[PDB]
Design a binder for this molecule. Structure first.
Ligand SMILES: Cc1cc2nc3c(=O)[nH]c(=O)nc-3n(C[C@H](O)[C@H](O)[C@H](O)COP(=O)(O)OP(=O)(O)OC[C@H]3O[C@@H](n4cnc5c(N)ncnc54)[C@H](O)[C@@H]3O)c2cc1C
Ligand SMILES: NC(=O)c1ccc[n+]([C@@H]2O[C@H](COP(=O)([O-])OP(=O)(O)OC[C@H]3O[C@@H](n4cnc5c(N)ncnc54)[C@H](O)[C@@H]3O)[C@@H](O)[C@H]2O)c1
Ligand SMILES: O=C(O)[C@H]1CCCNC1
Ligand SMILES: [Mg+2]
Lengths: 1218, 107, 54
């Protein structure tokens, strides 16, 4: 039996002093980074003045020859609006997908110019309109208003005809064939390079590959690089690495799992591929540059650079190159490492200094991961100082490295030109620029008549498809508000402003190196409301080394879970708790609760209830906040327990502990916002939690119940009692009295005994729908001492779909699908179960998905390299496998990963893809790593949404599309609680995506949302921000009808309900950059009304209508004559039901009657098939006395929507942050 | 159509142009249900006309128009109300219904 | 342009023929100017050979 965590995340190599200095700087506070950069970048006043003069001269040259762009001239000639310009370029792009020229021109003349372009051109014309929007307007719009573009295209064609189409086609052909790329193929690019080479430029060809998703992708990128090296080397013809052309590669193109977590595969599989390419570059004596990518790949890439530079087979060749990003805090330390490596190896490493291309993505990633700080600067001027400081370091080392200063900023250029001094020879250093962007500047640099310094042009090479994939990121490099190229084209920016010295500006700031005011550190995402939980950086070697030791220590602990009654630990049946990934690994011991002790615990909770209710809400919230601090400090140990007890990966364990911390802090803050003396607790609450979020959901339910003033009986899932016991220990340490929080480990029998206990005043259940239904039936037997139903929150299963159309980027889709379906072995309630692919793209995406499936590592989760862990039990495994084999037996195509022999000691199911004919082929939630794939024709999208809704579930839902019309359609028609656009569908964040569904997926209110605490008190408070200015119009029609009938009191109550209803609430919740998180209140659906009196019926109708619902009224009430002559608008919402089971599904119920009538109705309601109904009951006297007899909080449905606004390739809002 | 508004000139030509800014991302849900019903009964040409009407309808357009400071000037497209349909043929009726439903109307 | 330049004369006629005040007569001429320029611009944005007159 392998020792737990003995091989968790060993580094590729022992970290040298120089490597450790890099890691130490990863997230160093910005105020600490700047002072040494300012000092290193300082130059003499004489040099600064000469640099400013050179920069001014270059800028004056740039602005003097600056003409109007081709697109601008086209927009001017045809008087195009911006949308028309964008639509025209999209049309031109589509026409260029027609390969034959004569065919294309015939389509233009005979069909496009004089008729409906729509009839002639499965794929929206406007798929890339966000890119063309950047080209035309300079502004990024993340999604495409395809209806506006279609209108604009019709308008411009009908107005201007063939001539404008011809001009647009010719413009797009030039831009996509000669500007965004040097050429479509390496041979074409090489042919077009001779002109500038003759002037003194050189070239580095960028083959535009990146982010391989499959082994086949990586092999394709490999053979593309290999073929390009041959062409470049043949053309170089012995010119060598400085005069002659070279190639640039991205490591992410060469392996589908290029990450620190997969470092062993990277060194074993990616490295030999780079070596083979480098050997070919050596033979031709050309440069081979490794481009720099995301910050979490920097240090990993250094391990490849080290091995290659020490490999004797590459000796004699100085063409190996490596990019370093000056926007990164580690940059100077990386340079120190590289310079030393160049000294040790004797290789004159070609070092390309760039600022960095991934800035907005780095901000978003650090915020999402809750990390200490950013790995990049947050003020643009800091990057500029960093660049100059790093140039100073490089210029001191030209004997051992070849510095390559890649920049389009004439101020940066001038500073370095003068820093380098008078002595120059080709080979000492060079500048670099981007093809079709930097030539105007560098035509003022290259040549004896200019500055006589060489410039290497980074030359993209590729087809239209290849160049468009990440063109947005490239356009933002030089097109943001802080970008030099954007500013040089802004007439409101003076030359004096452009030549401003960033070194001196930073030096004079009040606080040198202060963070940008408008970028929140991850801890501060929520501002004054609460402190964000902190994560851990699994790319940081210090973090991995520290976590390795903490994880090993956690595995040595004698974890136990006992029945912790108010009186102390109780005796019971004790058994071991085994690691699901290896049953030989005993994690701890659980003593389970007898049914007698469960009943005793409820009585003890009932006796203790007044004492806990008397703790003021602020103090109860303080306990939650203290518990959050304790869990944050204990996170490494908690991770180890979650990994081993629940079979979770470290990444998912981190998120689990963060969620528990977030629940504690969120419910604490919500309490401080709401709870007062009049919001009395229900009493003892039974909290029954599932195994799959054994700390987070466990903590969330208990924390909410406790902070609302209720004592808690906590019944964790039988599979995962140990982490639950630790959570209870932490809450008790934080100040929750033992009498207020009792842990009762055991199976469903303990849960059922707790539910059935007479003093149980409320039940919070998260688990399967089938078990919730049994709990619902048991609670229907009971009424509170006041004679009202026992509140049940039942958050249950999902049958979660993702719809993908032909506008989505397949690589993005596949990543989000692989994560959503197979993370946690599909054992998230939110997991993607059904992927729906538009027919035209289905085969391509399916091929990519299967390829990505086979790159997953399944095994025991005490290794960072494991992507998918075990399923929780052999019974779960058998249940999942029975489903897979049923599908296989029906002839459905089944793709499965092969499992390693090591999985035999645990319970594993390989990630599986099953292709279905229809969504209806899938009949039940299969809680495992099983993705079902269906295909749909675009015209059947609305029917498909019906099919998704038809399962009865409504938990999470994803949509991948760029098209606003599709977003609007799908999101308006789907009925699910958590919607996700252009991102994965998992990992809902407390207070950001309040989580919970409808139908068979939940009663609500949503956990992690603002209605939750109000369910746990007898009188719900008004949640923060909970109101709406909208009044339901059918409610208004009903109020007028009531007035016409003379029911004046009820009409007033109806108007009050119309105002008090929060239907129509529509909020954006604070969260990370690059995402829009929305929270809205909608009608629940059809509410079952069970009235007893005419006035009761009118009050019930008012409540239901005010919240946007339709109703089914019990025909057995005999009250049909009370609704004579209803307005048609109200009648449309009213049905009468004799057979309630036939007229569902309902989305809630309102009941009027005495206690025994309520009990009877509650039993009849519990017997209805399908979803658990949130039932509210009141007596006739209560309706007369209490305007809030029926609470409107429970008659609306919460919907959370999370939109990835960075999905097009950049963040429009951050383009304004410099 | 309104004088001083973007639909006006289109009434004075035999084929109306697409006015500036005249589009909507919203699709009438009853139109969508009608298109599916047409699909189910094999009325393929009519279902296509229905989907096309659903998309080209500007129902739900909601624009702020440029004007003076201190004022917000909004322009929105709503359903007309109830449209009288005087068909002659079944297909003609389906096309009339598609047009009316796509623009949010009853008939 | 002509109505703008001749607004004072147009005002006097509108005041005397239609009984309007000076402020309302100014607004009237401005509206005529705005209609002219608005329909001119709307034409430039929309009308092509397939939009035949009635
Ligand atoms: C030949 C060449 C090779 C390149 N290779 C790579 C590569 O391998 N890896 C890579 O990441 N990119 C690469 N780039 C792109 C480069 O990193 C920059 O994104 C782009 O060139 C920046 O423009 P700049 O230095 O010309 O001018 P500028 O307009 O001076 O610089 C703009 C840069 O400032 C930075 N910045 C913007 N806002 C902020 C902010 N709020 N806080 C901190 N910094 C900010 C960004 O890096 C931005 O790109 C390359 C560029 C060229 C020309
Ligand atoms: N909507 C959500 O937020 C959410 C979150 C996580 C999991 N889930 C659902 O939870 C299911 C998986 O978790 P699970 O396997 O632990 O669910 P489960 O239904 O098997 O058990 C959940 C808890 O109910 C208890 N239980 C079983 N029978 C009981 C009974 N007759 N009376 C009282 N308690 C009883 C169990 O001991 C456990 O503590 C999945 O269906 C998943 O979709 C939903
Ligand atoms: O995966 C999700 O979206 C949530 C599932 C249950 C609660 N934790 C996160
Ligand atoms: Mg179970």
């Amino acid at each position: 039996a392998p020792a737990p965590f003995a091989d968790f995340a060993p580094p590729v190599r022992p970290q040298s002093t120089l490597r450790r200095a890099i890691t130490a700087a990863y997230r160093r506070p910005e105020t600490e980074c700047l002072p040494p950069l300012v000092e290193a970048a300082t130059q003499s006043k004489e040099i600064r003045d000469a640099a400013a003069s050179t920069a001014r001269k270059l800028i004056e040259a740039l602005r003097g020859k600056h003409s109007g762009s081709g697109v601008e001239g086209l927009v001017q000639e045809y008087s195009l609006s911006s949308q028309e310009g964008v639509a025209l370029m999209c049309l031109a792009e589509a026409l260029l997908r027609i390969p034959d020229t004569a065919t294309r021109d015939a389509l233009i003349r005979d069909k496009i110019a004089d008729g409906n372009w729509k009839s002639h051109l499965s794929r929206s014309l406007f798929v890339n309109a966000a890119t063309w929007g950047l080209v035309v307007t300079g502004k990024l719009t993340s999604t495409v208003n395809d209806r506006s573009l279609a209108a604009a295209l019709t308008r411009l064609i009908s107005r201007c005809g063939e001539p404008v189409i011809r001009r647009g086609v010719d413009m797009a052909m030039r831009m996509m064939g000669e500007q965004f790329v040097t050429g479509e193929t390496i041979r074409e690019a090489l042919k077009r390079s001779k002109e500038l080479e003759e002037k003194g430029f050189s070239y580095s060809y960028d083959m535009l590959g990146e982010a391989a998703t499959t082994a086949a992708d990586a092999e394709r990128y490999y053979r593309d690089y290999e073929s390009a090296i041959h062409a470049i080397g043949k053309a170089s013809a012995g010119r060598g690495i400085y005069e002659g052309p070279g190639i640039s590669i991205k490591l992410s193109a060469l392996h589908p799992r290029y990450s620190r977590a997969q470092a062993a595969r990277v060194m074993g599989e990616l490295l030999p591929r780079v070596k083979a390419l480098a050997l070919l570059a050596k033979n031709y004596d050309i440069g081979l540059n490794i481009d720099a990518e995301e910050a979490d790949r920097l240090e990993l890439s250094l391990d490849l650079l080290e091995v290659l530079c020490l490999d004797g087979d590459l000796s004699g060749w100085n063409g190996m190159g490596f990019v370093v990003q000056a926007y990164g805090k580690r940059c100077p330390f990386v340079l120190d490492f590289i310079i030393d490596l160049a000294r040790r190896s004797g290789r004159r490493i070609m070092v390309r200094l760039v600022k960095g291309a991934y800035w907005d993505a780095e901000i978003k990633r650090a915020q999402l991961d809750g990390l200490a700080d950013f790995p990049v600067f947050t003020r643009k001027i800091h990057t500029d100082v960093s660049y100059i400081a790093c140039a100073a370091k490089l210029l001191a080392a030209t004997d051992v490295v070849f510095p390559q200063f890649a920049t389009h900023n004439a101020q940066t250029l001038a500073a370095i030109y003068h820093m380098a001094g008078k002595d120059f020879h080709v080979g000492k250093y060079e500048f670099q620029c981007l093809h079709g962007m930097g030539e105007p500047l560098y035509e003022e640099v290259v040549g004896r008549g200019k500055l006589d310094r060489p410039c290497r042009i980074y030359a993209p090479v590729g087809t239209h498809e290849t160049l468009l994939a990440y063109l947005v990121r490239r356009l933002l490099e030089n097109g943001a508000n802080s970008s030099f190229v954007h500013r040089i084209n802004d007439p409101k920016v003076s030359i004096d402003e452009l030549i401003a010295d960033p070194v001196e500006v930073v030096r004079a700031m009040p606080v040198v190196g202060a963070k940008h005011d408008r970028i929140a550190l991850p801890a501060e995402l929520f501002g004054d409301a609460r402190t964000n939980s902190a994560g851990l950086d699994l790319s940081n070697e210090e973090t991995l080394a520290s976590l390795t030791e903490a994880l090993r220590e956690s595995a040595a602990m004698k974890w136990t879970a006992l029945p912790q009654l108010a009186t102390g630990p109780a005796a019971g049946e004790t058994r071991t708790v085994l690691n699901p990934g290896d049953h030989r690994d005993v994690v701890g011991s659980v003593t389970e609760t007898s049914e007698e002790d469960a009943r005793r615990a409820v009585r003890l909770a009932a006796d203790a209830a007044p004492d806990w209710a008397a703790v003021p809400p602020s103090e109860r919230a303080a306990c939650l906040d203290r518990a959050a601090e304790l869990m944050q400090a204990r996170m490494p140990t908690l991770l180890g327990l979650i990994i081993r007890e629940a079979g979770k990966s470290a990444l998912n364990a981190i998120a689990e502990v963060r969620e528990a911390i977030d629940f504690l802090r969120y419910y604490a803050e919500q309490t401080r916002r709401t709870l007062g003396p009049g919001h009395g607790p229900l009493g003892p609450i039974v909290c029954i939690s599932p195994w799959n979020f054994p700390l987070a959901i466990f903590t969330g339910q208990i924390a909410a119940a406790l902070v609302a003033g209720n004592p808690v009986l906590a019944k964790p899932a039988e599979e995962t009692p140990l982490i639950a016991a630790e959570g209870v220990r932490i809450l008790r340490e934080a100040g929750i009295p033992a009498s207020a929080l009792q842990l009762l480990p055991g199976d469903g029998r303990v849960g059922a005994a707790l539910v059935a206990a007479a003093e149980t005043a409320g039940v919070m259940f998260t688990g399967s729908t089938e078990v919730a239904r049994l709990i619902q039936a048991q609670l229907a037997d009971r009424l509170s001492p006041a004679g009202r139903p026992i509140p049940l929150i039942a958050e249950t299963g999902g049958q979660n779909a993702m719809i993908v159309d032909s506008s989505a980027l397949a690589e993005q889709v596949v990543g989000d699908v692989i994560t959503s379906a197979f993370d946690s072995a599909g054992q998230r309630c939110s997991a993607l179960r059904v992927l729906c692919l538009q027919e035209d793209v289905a085969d391509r995406i399916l091929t990519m998905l299967k390829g990505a499936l086979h790159e997953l590592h399944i095994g025991r989760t005490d290794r960072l390299s494991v992507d998918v862990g075990p399923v929780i039990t052999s019974e779960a495994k058998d249940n999942i496998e029975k489903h897979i084999e049923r599908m296989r037996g029906l002839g459905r195509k089944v793709e499965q990963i092969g499992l390693a022999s090591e999985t035999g000691v645990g319970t594993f199911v390989p990630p599986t893809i099953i292709e279905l004919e229809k969504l209806s082929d899938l009949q039940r939630e299969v809680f495992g790593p099983v993705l079902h794939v269906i295909r749909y024709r675009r015209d059947d999208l609305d029917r498909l949404v019906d099919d998704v809704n038809a399962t009865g579930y409504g938990l999470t839902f994803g949509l991948h599309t760029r098209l606003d019309e599709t977003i609007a359609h799908v999101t308006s028609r789907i009925k699910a609680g958590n919607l996700y656009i252009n991102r994965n569908i998992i990992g809902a964040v407390v207070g950001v995506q309040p989580f919970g569904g409808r139908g068979l997926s939940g009663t609500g209110p949503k956990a992690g949302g603002p209605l939750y605490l109000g369910r746990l008190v007898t009188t719900a408070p008004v949640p923060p921000q909970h109101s709406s200015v909208h009044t339901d119009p059918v409610l208004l029609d009903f109020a007028k009808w009531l007035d016409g009938k003379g029911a004046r009191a009820e009409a007033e109550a109806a108007r009050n309900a119309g105002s008090s209803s929060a239907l129509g609430l529509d909020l954006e919740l604070p969260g990370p950059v690059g995402e829009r998180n929305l929270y809205t209140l909608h009608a629940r659906g059809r509410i079952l009304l069970v009235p007893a009196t005419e006035s009761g019926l009118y009050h019930q109708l008012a409540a239901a209508l005010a919240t946007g619902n339709s109703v089914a009224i019990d025909a057995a009430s005999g009250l049909q004559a009370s609704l004579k002559n209803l307005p048609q608008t109200v009648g449309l919402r009213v049905s009468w039901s004799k057979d309630w089971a036939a007229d569902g599904p309902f989305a809630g119920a309102l009941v009027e009657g005495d206690a025994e009538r309520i009990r009877a109705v509650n039993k009849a309601i519990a017997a209805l098939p399908g979803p658990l109904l949130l039932v509210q009951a009141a007596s006739s006297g209560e309706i007369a006395r209490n305007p809030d007899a029926y609470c409107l909080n429970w008659l609306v449905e919460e919907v959370s929507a999370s939109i990835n606004t960075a999905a097009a390739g950049g963040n429009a809002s951050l383009m304004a942050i410099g």
